Amino acid sequence: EIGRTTDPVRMYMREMGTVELLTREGEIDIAKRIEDGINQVQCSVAEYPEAITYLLEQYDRVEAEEARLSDLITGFVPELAREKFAELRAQYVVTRDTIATAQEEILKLSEVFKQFRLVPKQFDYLVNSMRVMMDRVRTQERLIMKLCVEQCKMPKKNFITLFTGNETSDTWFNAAIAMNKPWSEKLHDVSEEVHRALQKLQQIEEETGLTIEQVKDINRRMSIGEAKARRAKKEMVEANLRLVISIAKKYTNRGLQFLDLIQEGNIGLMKAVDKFEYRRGYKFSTYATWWIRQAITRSIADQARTIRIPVHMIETINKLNRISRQMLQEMGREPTPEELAERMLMPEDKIRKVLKIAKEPISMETPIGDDEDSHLGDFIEDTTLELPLDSATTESLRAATHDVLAGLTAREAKVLRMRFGIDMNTDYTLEEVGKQFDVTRERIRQIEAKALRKLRHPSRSEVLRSFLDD
Amino acid sequence: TPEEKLLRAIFGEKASDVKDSSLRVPNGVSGTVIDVQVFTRDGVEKDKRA
Numbered sequence: 111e112i113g114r115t116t117d118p119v120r121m122y123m124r125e126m127g128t129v130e131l132l133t134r135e136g137e138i139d140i141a142k143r144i145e146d147g148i149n150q151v152q153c154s155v156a157e158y159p160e161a162i163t164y165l166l167e168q169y170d171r172v173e174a175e176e177a178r179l180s181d182l183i184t185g186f187v188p189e190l191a192r193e194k195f196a197e198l199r200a201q202y203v204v205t206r207d208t209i210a211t212a213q214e215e216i217l218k219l220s221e222v223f224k225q226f227r228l229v230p231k232q233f234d235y236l237v238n239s240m241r242v243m244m245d246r247v248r249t250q251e252r253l254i255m256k257l258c259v260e261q262c263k264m265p266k267k268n269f270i271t272l273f274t275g276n277e278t279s280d281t282w283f284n285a286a287i288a289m290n291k292p293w294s295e296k297l298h299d300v301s302e303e304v305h306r307a308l309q310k311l312q313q314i315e316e317e318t319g320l321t322i323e324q325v326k327d328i329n330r331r332m333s334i335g336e337a338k339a340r341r342a343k344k345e346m347v348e349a350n351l352r353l354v355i356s357i358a359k360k361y362t363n364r365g366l367q368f369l370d371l372i373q374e375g376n377i378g379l380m381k382a383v384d385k386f387e388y389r390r391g392y393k394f395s396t397y398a399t400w401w402i403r404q405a406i407t408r409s410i411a412d413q414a415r416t417i418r419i420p421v422h423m424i425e426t427i428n429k430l431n432r433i434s435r436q437m438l439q440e441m442g443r444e445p446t447p448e449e450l451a452e453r454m455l456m457p458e459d460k461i462r463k464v465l466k467i468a469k470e471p472i473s474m475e476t477p478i479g480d481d482e483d484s485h486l487g488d489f490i491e492d493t494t495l496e497l498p499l500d501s502a503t504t505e506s507l508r509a510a511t512h513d514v515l516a517g518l519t520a521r522e523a524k525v526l527r528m529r530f531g532i533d534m535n536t537d538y539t540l541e542e543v544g545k546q547f548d549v550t551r552e553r554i555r556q557i558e559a560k561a562l563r564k565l566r567h568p569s570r571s572e573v574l575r576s577f578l579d580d
Numbered sequence: 581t582p583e584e585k586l587l588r589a590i591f592g593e594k595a596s597d598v599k600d601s602s603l604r605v606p607n608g609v610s611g612t613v614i615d616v617q618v619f620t621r622d623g624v625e626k627d628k629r630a
């Protein structure tokens with residue numbers, strides 16, 4: 111039963127039905143697990159001082175007329191906020207000035223930070239800064255192990271014993287070389303790179319202000335918390351796929367595919383899971399339905415037409431259609447667009463424009479009866495082409511104007527050709543022409559006027575006069 | 581197009597603001613006009629024929 115089908119709907123239904131829906135107790139348990147993981151991640155990220163440093167820097171930037179208070183803290187768990195930030199700054203400075211009390215004061219600072227409701231973007235910035243620093247530390251560590259374990263070929267267990275804990279000194283530097291083995295004394299050339307890696311680690315440690323093992327502990331603790339939260343969210347999504355499908359059932363004939371609708375519903379369900387709260391006592395379905403229907407409707411308004419229409423205009427069109435239907439049902443027959451202005455609040459032209467908005471375009475390959483098996487696309491002609499009669503008239507006019515310009519004097523022909531875009535890429539202004547010819551602008555104008563008068567004189571340009579078709 | 585500015589300068593002609601899109605009898609057919617009907621949209625002033 112693994113195959114014998116082609117439609118992906120059946121396979122999706124099978125994969126979805128392989129799992130079973132939850133109950134209220136399971137929802138409460140999953141919410142509790144999510145809260146526990148979030149609290150663990152919050153503690154792990156508050157236990158670091160660089161979070162407080164970034165908080166103080168952002169607060170200083172806000173106070174320096176460079177940002178706003180809206181994206182600083184998402185409420186509280188505004189003079190009170192200012193005094194709390196001042197207290198946090200004082201706690202941080204006394205923590206930096208109390209380098210055996212540093213650990214306890216860091217714990218107190220972390221508790222006060224957790225007492226503050228920051229912004230998710232700020233929390234993500236703290237998380238990615240932690241990731242950057244731990245990635246630098248682990249890159250240095252892998253360079254350290256590659257420089258002697260994979261280069262000096264020094265023993266595994268010996269490396270583990272003399273490297274677990276120190277990670278800073280020459281315990282892995284001189285021992286791997288001066289241990290009287292035939293393959294040990296051959297990499298004083300890479301000893302320099304070993305020293306450079308040690309200096310890089312020392313600089314990173316000085317910048318961080320803490321050890322390395324505690325950093326690794328925080329990193330893997332928050333990784334475990336994130337994995338637990340992801341597992342719980344995946345369980346919730348797999349449980350509520352059925353509700354997503356049930357909600358998406360009712361929009362299957364609005365220009366969008368059922369699979370697209372259910373995918374948008376899944377996205378909305380994930381968004382709702384990301385913000386669900388179980389302390390209110392309400393069931394998850396009531397909170398998820400709003401998000402799912404909002405996502406489905408937004409997708410329908412966005413990507414269900416060949417020509418995109420804004421959400422507000424789509425809502426206006428829907429409201430107009432609903433009114434019109436209600437008035438038709440109540441009164442008896444189709445009303446007039448002028449009468450809709452009395453019922454609604456419109457200047458009587460917006461309704462006309464909405465009605466004049468073009469519907470979905472007609473298919474090019476639609477047939478018209480038999481018509482010797484011909485479609486609509488066989489009766490559309492290109493309007494951008496120029497007639498051969500027009501091209502021949504243009505060629506004749508060019509020849510005639512060239513012949514007429516040959517008769518005039520050389521200077522007159524040159525100044526004419528310069529004034530008008532004739533036989534050249536572009537025309538030249540009267541001032542540039544005068545400058546090129548070393549002749550004043552007014553004299554150029556007078557010579558042009560004399561030429562025009564001579565051309566207006568009769569017994570010439572008879573074909574030019576004949577070039578008018580009126 | 582080029583040389584049309586020169587032609588207009590010589591002839592002092594102005595370009596038509598409107599384009600002729602009038603209805604005309606198809607070629608090769610003759611006859612007599614027996615009925616004329618005019619339909620107009622609401623809000624548009626009617627003319628003498630209407």
